[PDB]
Design a protein around this ligand. Structure first.
Ligand SMILES: *C/C=C(C)/C=C/C=C(C)/C=C/C1=C(C)CCCC1(C)C
Length: 137
């Protein structure tokens, strides 16, 4: 299908509980939530190759990967990891992450397209699941 587009967020669930699990402490969480949980996402897709830009007001992250091809990126909390993306359906990809150094919670994210226009992100830390919902620009 086509994940390609400029996405803006309409819903966000359990983002604070995600950071709590990740170890961010209370004060930092509250701010992070309030300032930096209206992010912009841009995706350009060339088949099974992905460019992904996620940006706050003063921060940007650029992710590049081919599906099935192991790459390096960051956990939600800024820690470096090895990632691998696989398909689970036509409109849904899944990514597992292994830390580069450290022990830490088990992290992953998924990404799905509805047919009703929605782009759905999940990020997972152990048994907590943050769900963010986007529609197009
Ligand atoms: C396919 C979609 C992907 C890979 C989206 C990833 C989104 C993130 C890794 C979001 C990360 C965030 C931070 C690292 C801090 C600011 C808050 C978020 C949720 C925008």
């Amino acid at each position: 299908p086509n994940f390609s587009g400029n996405w803006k967020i309409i819903r966000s669930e359990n983002f604070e509980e995600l950071l709590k699990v990740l170890g961010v402490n209370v004060m930092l969480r509250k701010i992070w939530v309030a300032a930096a949980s209206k992010p912009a996402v841009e995706i350009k897709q060339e088949g099974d190759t992905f460019y992904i830009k996620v940006s706050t007001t003063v921060w940007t992250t650029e992710i590049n990967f081919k599906v099935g091809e192991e790459f390096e990126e960051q956990t939600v909390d800024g820690r470096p990891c090895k990632s691998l993306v696989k398909w689970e359906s036509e409109n849904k990809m899944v990514c597992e992450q292994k830390l580069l150094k450290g022990e830490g919670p088990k992290t992953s994210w998924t990404k799905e397209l509805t047919n009703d226009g929605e782009l759905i992100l999940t990020m997972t830390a152990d048994d907590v699941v943050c769900t963010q919902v986007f529609v197009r620009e």
